[PDB]
Amino acid sequence: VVGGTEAQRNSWPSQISLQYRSGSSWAHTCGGTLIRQNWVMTAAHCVDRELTFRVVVGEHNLNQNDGTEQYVGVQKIVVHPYWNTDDVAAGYDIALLRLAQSVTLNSYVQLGVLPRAGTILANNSPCYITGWGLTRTNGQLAQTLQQAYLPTVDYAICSSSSYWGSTVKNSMVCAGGDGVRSGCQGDSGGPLHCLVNGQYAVHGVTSFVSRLGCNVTRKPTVFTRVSAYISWINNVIASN
Ligand SMILES: [Cl-]
Ligand code: NA
């Protein structure tokens, strides 16, 4: 997250860190949202590589013992069947991870609430992106979870020529684009949390930023629209 602030330890308990084994250590690569005690929702492009992955729930600082983490291996991966890694603009950037163990819930570990199917936020709806992604374009990952306030940009505006043009689809949510704050590499797969009727719900799964930079004016962060996949999610969990 570029232009973010440090999140309080218990603000976003459904946020997880998706990590891969690197030598004798684990490296954060993407965020995710805990949606069942043994299921995580993340971006399909985060699991394109055939690596060993683990999820960390109750994570706040990637580099220091928080006293609250639960480390759980990824046992099964279900990528959306229409995902194509060389066509992120087509959409379908979503995948579900079944965990090897069911995590224990508490104030640092909770399930993310998803929006009702088909829900589309009005332009400029207030939302927060959260993640440990780069804090600057071509920078480094954050040590502590960051949050940034990114209002939605509706399809009509987001798909206009000065914004994302034909690249954005109605199956995505755009947010931000002010040139100061945005998601960045390493935030992919994580949540876009938006307050609706007094409750936050996870409306987006971070998918991509501009090749020209993370925080680029009129290039809002683009997320997979969670509300377009409610039936898909329910169907995968019911058959797995
Ligand atoms: Cl949360
Ligand atoms: Na930690």
Asked if 183 and 133 count as a contact pair (C-beta separation under 8 A), the reply is yes
- As separate numbers, helices (DSSP H) first and strands (DSSP E) second, the chain gives 2, 14
Distance CA 54, CA 43 (A): 15
Helix or strand (DSSP H, E) at 15: strand 15-22
37 marked as part of a ligand binding site: no
Q: Compute the distance from residue 202 Cα to the ligand 1 centre, in Å.
A: 8
Tell me which method was used to determine the 3D structure: X-ray
Q: Compute the distance from residue 44 Cα to the ligand 1 centre, in Å.
A: 20
Resolution stated for this PDB structure, in Å: 1.7
50 marked as part of a ligand binding site: no
| Residues with C-beta atoms within 5 A of ion ligand 1 | 12, 14
- Nearest ligand by distance to the CA of 200: 1
- Nearest ligand by distance to the CA of 57: 2
Go through the chain and tell me how many residues it has: 240
Q: Which residues are catalytic?
A: 45, 93, 188
Q: Compute the distance from residue 11 Cα to the ligand 1 centre, in Å.
A: 7
6 marked as part of a ligand binding site: no
| Domains of the chain, earliest start first | 1-12+112-227 (2.40.10.10), 13-111+228-240 (2.40.10.10)
- Nearest ligand by distance to the CA of 28: 2
3-class SS letters over the chain: CECCEECCCCCCCCEEEEEEEECCEEEEEEEEEEEECCEEEECHHHHCCCCCEEEEECCCECCCCCCCCEEEEEEEEEECCCCCCCCHHHCCCCEEEEECCCCCCECCECCCCCCCCCCCCCCCCCEEEEECCECCCCCCECCECEEEECCEECHHHHCCCCCCHHHCCCCEEEECCCCCCECCCCCCCCEEEEEECCEEEEEEEEEECECCECCECCECEEEEEHHHCHHHHHHHHHHC
How far from the centroid of its chain's Cα atoms is residue 239's Cα?
Answer: 24
61 marked as part of a ligand binding site: yes
